[PDB]
Ligand binder design. Sequence first.
Ligand SMILES: *[C@@H]1O[C@H](CO)[C@@H](O[C@@H]2O[C@H](CO)[C@@H](O)[C@H](O)[C@H]2NC(C)=O)[C@H](O)[C@H]1NC(C)=O
Ligand SMILES: *[C@@H]1O[C@H](CO)[C@@H](O)[C@H](O)[C@H]1NC(C)=O
Ligand SMILES: *[C@@H]1O[C@H](CO)[C@@H](O)[C@H](O)[C@H]1NC(C)=O
Ligand SMILES: *[C@@H]1O[C@H](CO)[C@@H](O)[C@H](O)[C@H]1NC(C)=O
Ligand SMILES: *[C@@H]1O[C@H](CO)[C@@H](O)[C@H](O)[C@H]1NC(C)=O
Ligand SMILES: *[C@@H]1O[C@H](CO)[C@@H](O)[C@H](O)[C@H]1NC(C)=O
Ligand SMILES: *[C@@H]1O[C@H](CO)[C@@H](O)[C@H](O)[C@H]1NC(C)=O
Lengths: 108, 53, 173, 173, 173
Amino acid sequence: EDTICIGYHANNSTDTVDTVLEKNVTVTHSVNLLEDSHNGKLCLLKGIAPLQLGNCSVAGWILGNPECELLISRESWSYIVEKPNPENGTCYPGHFADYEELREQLSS
Amino acid sequence: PMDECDAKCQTPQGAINSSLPFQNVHPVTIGECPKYVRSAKLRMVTGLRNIPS
Amino acid sequence: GLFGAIAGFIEGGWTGMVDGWYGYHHQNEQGSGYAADQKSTQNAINGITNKVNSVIEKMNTQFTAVGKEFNKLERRMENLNKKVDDGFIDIWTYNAELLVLLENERTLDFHDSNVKNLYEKVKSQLKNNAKEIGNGCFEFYHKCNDECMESVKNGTYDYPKYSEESKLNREKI
Amino acid sequence: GLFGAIAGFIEGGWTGMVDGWYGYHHQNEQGSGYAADQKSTQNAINGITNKVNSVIEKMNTQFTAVGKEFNKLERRMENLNKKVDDGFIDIWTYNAELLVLLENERTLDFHDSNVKNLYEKVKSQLKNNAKEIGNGCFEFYHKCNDECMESVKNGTYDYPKYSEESKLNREKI
Amino acid sequence: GLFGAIAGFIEGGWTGMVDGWYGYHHQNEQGSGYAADQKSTQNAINGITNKVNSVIEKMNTQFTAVGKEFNKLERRMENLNKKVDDGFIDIWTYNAELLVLLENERTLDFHDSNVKNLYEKVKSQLKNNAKEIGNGCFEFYHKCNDECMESVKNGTYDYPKYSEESKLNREKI
Ligand SMILES: *[C@@H]1O[C@H](CO)[C@@H](O[C@@H]2O[C@H](CO)[C@@H](O)[C@H](O)[C@H]2NC(C)=O)[C@H](O)[C@H]1NC(C)=O
Ligand SMILES: *[C@@H]1O[C@H](CO)[C@@H](O)[C@H](O)[C@H]1NC(C)=O
Ligand SMILES: *[C@@H]1O[C@H](CO)[C@@H](O)[C@H](O)[C@H]1NC(C)=O
Ligand SMILES: *[C@@H]1O[C@H](CO)[C@@H](O)[C@H](O)[C@H]1NC(C)=O
Ligand SMILES: *[C@@H]1O[C@H](CO)[C@@H](O)[C@H](O)[C@H]1NC(C)=O
Ligand SMILES: *[C@@H]1O[C@H](CO)[C@@H](O)[C@H](O)[C@H]1NC(C)=O
Ligand SMILES: *[C@@H]1O[C@H](CO)[C@@H](O)[C@H](O)[C@H]1NC(C)=O
């Protein structure tokens, strides 16, 4: 004869969480809060370009190393780009005091 | 590599989607950015449990 | 089934219906079928929207520059700034992780409570006119058409409709 | 009405009574009126007091001096101390805001649960002797005076008092 | 008794049984005794284990060196590093303390809910065949042996067993 029942949703899904009372806990729908990924690119802010040094040091950039493009046209930019191990330090070596401080002052 | 693409947050490992609150990816960032953790994952539930029978 | 249904008196969920997270399954002479409860479902999902907006937006992301660097004649500032940053990182990590665990727990409780409420709504009309059966379902001592289904969804039954049919078809049992 | 009453089977609240947050409304031949449940009400409000004491006091406010200032030859310390302070400010902000939202949610659940409990207490005495009606109320198959009201408030009925009057006045229905 | 039992319809606990946190008390002609519900008890305790693992492990403790020291010509760094460290200390303190209070609250609610669920499980079999009594207990209009006890524990009754004995021994009442 006739019958009424409750009902609710399930699916084929197997996305999972951890939870206080059980782990790998399966649900239908989820949402990843995290941005676990990176595009592996050096994009630019907002339409504002960054500064690039290529191979140069900050010393080779600021001082006028001819192997470093001076780039007076670069009036302002989004952020500074280097490599970790910059090639072209000073062709005539010498101490460069407060390198840190000048970097932080030229942070922006 | 350097690219013409645009962003709102950036790090050496890549340019970053500034939509979400968090990464676990690398602490160093510049811009309108997430915050770093030392973790694998964070996934809030929207739905609920799945059991067929 | 914190509050008694899902892994409670109910064992499991159903894959047939997809339009909304909750509903009923109707069974009558015309046939069988599933049909979703968009009222409470949409109310709940509005709650989830207001949650996740009230999780993401509560951050304030500055136009930031993270990193620094130092000489070896300022290890004070180096090991400090390490400890400082790692302190922050760990605190956000801990608070955030507990928030995900607890919020998903409260989401399970939110769902569980909503279905339990609806089960009481279904019961509230059909108390003596129709009986509990098994789990998850009520059997009628009378008969019910699709109009009766649609009525019982939106909080309408008209109690004296099949009061007497239930009052007689009970009495063999 | 997380647990089924307030925006649940109950639709709304009442402005007439002010002495305590909960109570009953009595209806009998002598008249109508509202009367507050100071027992559970005061128990709950003691809970709220212990909450807010256990929110405010858990801070420890030092005899503090916040600010600093620097030259332009220590932008490291400037932009650092900016990031440091803003980091703290944001973390307190986030944790605090989530605490207000969640605590008020749990306060709604606290109230909802207390009234639901009391509804079960009212039901537990008067199960067969008197019936559910509508929502929020029970009708008696017998009659009840102010002594009966005051008895049923404090957890007393004496079940065989009107057992028979209910057992006969049911039977027309 | 947030959800209605413990300091609710139940007044207090019992010291006789120790093998598991929950159970039943059986009363029949063979005698009296207590017996524990290891199913739901162990399920819950697995939950508590997963909690406390998910509290302790969510810390990450570095191979750390806490302290520093300074001259009096760097009071900036002194009073800073004081404020920095005290800031961290207070934030961990506040978050941790709220976590202990709230987690123990949710533990009480977890227990309360589990027993309430089980009370509904006990009721679900024996609805008309046996009655509510007092609080915490159901009286049978029929008789029940240790096999009947052990059956009713694991979610088995066979409803038509004593349906008729209840259907007749009711009728004097
Ligand atoms: C940056 O450094 C690399 C070194 O790897 C330079 O690479 C040289 O490029 C020239 C052509 O431009 C070749 O003739 C050399 O054989 C390359 N050497 C190596 C080791 O790769 C690169 O040119 C430098 N770029 C700038 C802009 O300075
Ligand atoms: C589950 O269903 C969704 C939607 O049809 C689909 O995207 C997904 O690939 C399916 N997964 C499996 C394992 O069938
Ligand atoms: C989840 O963890 C439980 C722990 O016992 C295990 O039984 C189950 O196989 C796990 N499932 C997956 C998909 O990892
Ligand atoms: C950024 O994230 C949002 C939300 O996840 C997504 O809609 C968008 O496509 C993403 N964009 C890129 C470029 O990753
Ligand atoms: C409820 O459903 C019935 C049909 O089952 C319909 O006549 C009535 O208008 C509906 N009411 C509302 C408020 O939707
Ligand atoms: C409860 O109320 C009745 C009257 O309604 C009174 O006789 C009795 O003493 C009261 N008991 C308590 C404990 O207040
Ligand atoms: C439940 O207990 C009964 C006896 O009391 C036994 O016959 C039955 O096999 C048990 N079932 C399970 C699933 O343990």
